[PDB]
Write a protein that binds this ligand. Structure first.
Ligand code: EFZ
Lengths: 543, 403
């Protein structure tokens, strides 16, 4: 079955010439097969015989397809694939089940062999030349060249999709009520028609595909739901998490632990509650992938507690365009967020989790923002719209923060949902000096070379202190300076510094950092009642 | 309906842009597919296969003056790899004009065809929700709007079309920047608006703005009756920083007042010397620094700072501290809750002035996270062009200053 669609013009990479490879010496059997095989597609029109006017060649092989003692072939286009031009990206993006709509019935039509159905570019064919070996290398070489898309060739996938995309455009317009997801050599067709009516349309489309030479399996060979889709198992009315099985075992190797955390982490998305903290600790210092590790009981408790979470599978439902989208977010740990997108409460579409490492110096609100942003995007990619958000943050809070942050930020129409823990600002710097408050003139500096330093302060109330630091850097000095001022201060303080780093860091009301010291300061700040922080030029000899 | 097409090429060695399309909302996709089927009928653009490896991002916006959607392509990458070039001049006229009105003339281009061999370089793609399908691939056959090569090639045609109005109304300035046409006159609002409607018809037959009103805002120094240790501190901080623009500024006399571990709240009187040092400074800041001249051969830069409460500040310079112009901006009525809105409005206003004054888009340094901007800027854009931009972290100092 050969296709009548127009061929895609193909060209070799800028200034390169076709493959000039050899044709491995074969056994009487291997040659016997190929000859028969070729003669088969030869009559089919798949390949044709080419004269000596073709100086190209690609190595051909013969392998007995496992399960069948019958001979099968294979052509090595590696060389060709290198010399071939680039095409557009074949995978725009993965269709996520949560994006699928609910259908009464659906059937998948595996096309597969269709490759050999799509005609190759008339002019490019010559480069697809290959030769058959004579048992003892008598005299000639029974040459052929590909006359259609070749298995394993670079272009095949790319070009097949297109063709497939075209051969479907007409049908796509006619039966809008019908859905068809294109994906590799699979054709996913779902609808809301009554089963019989559906089977009909299937055949209709099926014949349509056949109208262009595309051979597909009939009803009696079509695969039926539920469908094994990347991690998910989906039925016409719902999708389900293909329950995860954790191999219970004696000894554990490093490698094993990795793969475990792999699986485990992937599941964190769906089963929030999964933990790997202890499990991850086992890697520390690992010398070999095949090294075995003594699973700590803490890791035992955790690993077990997981096997339970991964017990109760959880189903989910599909997208209903008529319904608006609702995304809700919860704060799990520090910089650990969970969200779910549902159209009807408890009836989830998707759920994920995010873990934003300490980064540098960030805060919860910012983070939240980053999540909303991330989620927003997923949404535009899956459903084309952005969900209304239900956020654990007081409108007053959000307002106070964004109107005063230096960077442009924003959250789409969202609504406060009183579901603790709520995100809040852990402190705020006074806008002006605190009247009747001690004033600390903190300074810090360290010898970049020796890493020796002093940090200290003096106040309007005559108090003072200084400290010499070993193995430090200038910036840790400036911060330390401030830490002291915060320690020895008391509920209310005015702190002037000449440090720009700090003024920066803190003024950005961060509530978490990579730097322990900052964390220290931060804690100290939350503790205070009122803190005013001022900056002044350094080496200007001020106060 | 073709004409003899001019041959265009990419700068030597360069290859076609291959830019990934950003996910688009449903609402936008529809607008596009609709907008493109018709353009395909009309033979403007044509579907293309996979054998075309290039791509340029595409999307849709809608100006206030129109509830209908408008397609926009991001040729920034393509424009950048396109050969330069018969010419396109820039006047200093409208820079002074009383009133200028911008006209979206993009349309004209679609009349002119595009050199076969180059067309491949305009392949763009319309995405499918949840990737149900490999997006749609098109490629222009005519001059694309927003491509630097279009106003050029359509140079001839344009000049002609205009000449009448030109020397017939010479008391008017006409500038063209890509898909836009800037018209400036000192003729009072009545005549200006009517003359404009007059010119429209002239073009249609074929197929508010106020310069000077924009004066670089001087850096003002606050006046107190009494000063607190903090007040002087804040002040000295600003001047110190400002000496970078005016080396004339001195701060020693005030720094003297700050000697001692005093309480920020403590009140302090000014020595007659500090009174002078200050007064003298005030004067210096009364005018923009000497020696700042627009160097056409260098990149123009725009820096913006969120001042909050709705305000934003920005500066255009080629060399740090040698601003060509600085300004402020108060959020448009309505963007009262969303920054991105404002920032995109702000960027656009500036890019415009830029064009008006130097006929060159500034490169923007934006106070926002990339992710944020990329996610929502398209929602508020209403300009045919797209300037270059980078994201940064506003050094609080450069902020208090312009405040
Ligand atoms: O939007 C829907 N609805 C749907 C509902 C249940 C199932 Cl099991 C499958 C689908 C479907 C798909 C698909 C694979 C490509 C992902 C189909 F296209 F209909 F086949 O996409």
């Amino acid at each position: 079955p050969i296709s009548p669609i127009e061929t895609v013009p193909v060209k070799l990479k800028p200034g390169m010439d076709g493959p000039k490879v050899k044709q491995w010496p074969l056994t009487e059997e291997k040659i016997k097969a190929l000859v028969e095989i070729c003669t088969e597609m030869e009559k089919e029109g798949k390949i044709s015989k080419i004269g000596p006017e073709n100086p190209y060649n690609t190595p051909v092989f013969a392998i007995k397809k496992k399960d069948s003692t019958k001979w099968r072939k294979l052509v090595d286009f590696r060389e060709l694939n290198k010399r071939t031009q680039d095409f557009w990206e074949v995978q725009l993006g993965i269709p996520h089940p949560a994006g699928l709509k609910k259908n009464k019935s659906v059937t998948v039509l595996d096309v597969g062999d269709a490759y050999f159905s799509v005609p190759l570019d008339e002019d490019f064919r010559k480069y697809t030349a290959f030769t058959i070996p004579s048992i003892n290398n008598e005299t000639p070489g029974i040459r052929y060249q590909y006359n259609v898309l070749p298995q394993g060739w670079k272009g095949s996938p790319a070009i097949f999709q297109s063709s497939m995309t075209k051969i479907l455009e007409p049908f796509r317009k006619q039966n809008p009520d019908i859905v068809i997801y294109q994906y590799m050599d699979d054709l996913y067709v779902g609808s809301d028609l009554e089963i019989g009516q559906h089977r009909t349309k299937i055949e209709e489309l099926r014949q349509h595909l056949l109208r262009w030479g595309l051979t597909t399996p009939d009803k009696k060979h079509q695969k039926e739901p539920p469908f094994l889709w990347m991690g998910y198992e989906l039925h016409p009315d719902k999708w389900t998490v293909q329950p995860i099985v954790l191999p219970e075992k004696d000894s554990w190797t490093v490698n094993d632990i990795q793969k475990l955390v792999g699986k485990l982490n992937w599941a964190s998305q769906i089963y929030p509650g999964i933990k790997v903290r202890q499990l991850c600790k086992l890697l520390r210092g690992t010398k070999a992938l095949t090294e075995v590790i003594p699973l700590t009981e803490e890791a035992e408790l955790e690993l077990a507690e997981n096997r339970e979470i991964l017990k109760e599978p959880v189903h989910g439902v599909y997208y209903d365009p008529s319904k608006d989208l609702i995304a809700e977010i919860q704060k799990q740990g520090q910089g650990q967020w969970t969200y779910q997108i549902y159209q009807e409460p408890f009836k989830n579409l998707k759920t994920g989790k995010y873990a934003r490492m300490r980064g540098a110096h960030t805060n919860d609100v910012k983070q939240l923002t980053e999540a909303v942003q991330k989620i927003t995007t997923e949404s535009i990619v899956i459903w084309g719209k952005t969900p209304k958000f239900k956020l654990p943050i007081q409108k007053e809070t959000w307002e106070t923060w964004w109107t005063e942050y230096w960077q442009a930020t924003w959250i789409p129409e969202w609504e406060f949902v009183n579901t603790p823990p709520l995100v809040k600002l852990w402190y705020q710097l006074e806008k002006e000096p605190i009247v009747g408050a001690e004033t600390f003139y903190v300074d810090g500096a360290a010898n970049r070379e020796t890493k020796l330093g002093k940090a200290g302060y003096v106040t309007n109330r005559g108090r003072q202190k200084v400290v010499t630091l070993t193995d430090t850097t200038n910036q840790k000095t400036e911060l330390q300076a401030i830490y002291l001022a915060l320690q020895d201060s008391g509920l209310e303080v005015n702190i002037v510094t000449d440090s720009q780093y700090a003024l920066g860091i803190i003024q950005a009301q961060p509530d978490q950092s990579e730097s322990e010291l900052v964390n220290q300061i931060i804690e100290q700040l939350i503790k205070k009642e009122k803190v005013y922080l001022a900056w002044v030029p350094a080496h200007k000899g001020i106060g």
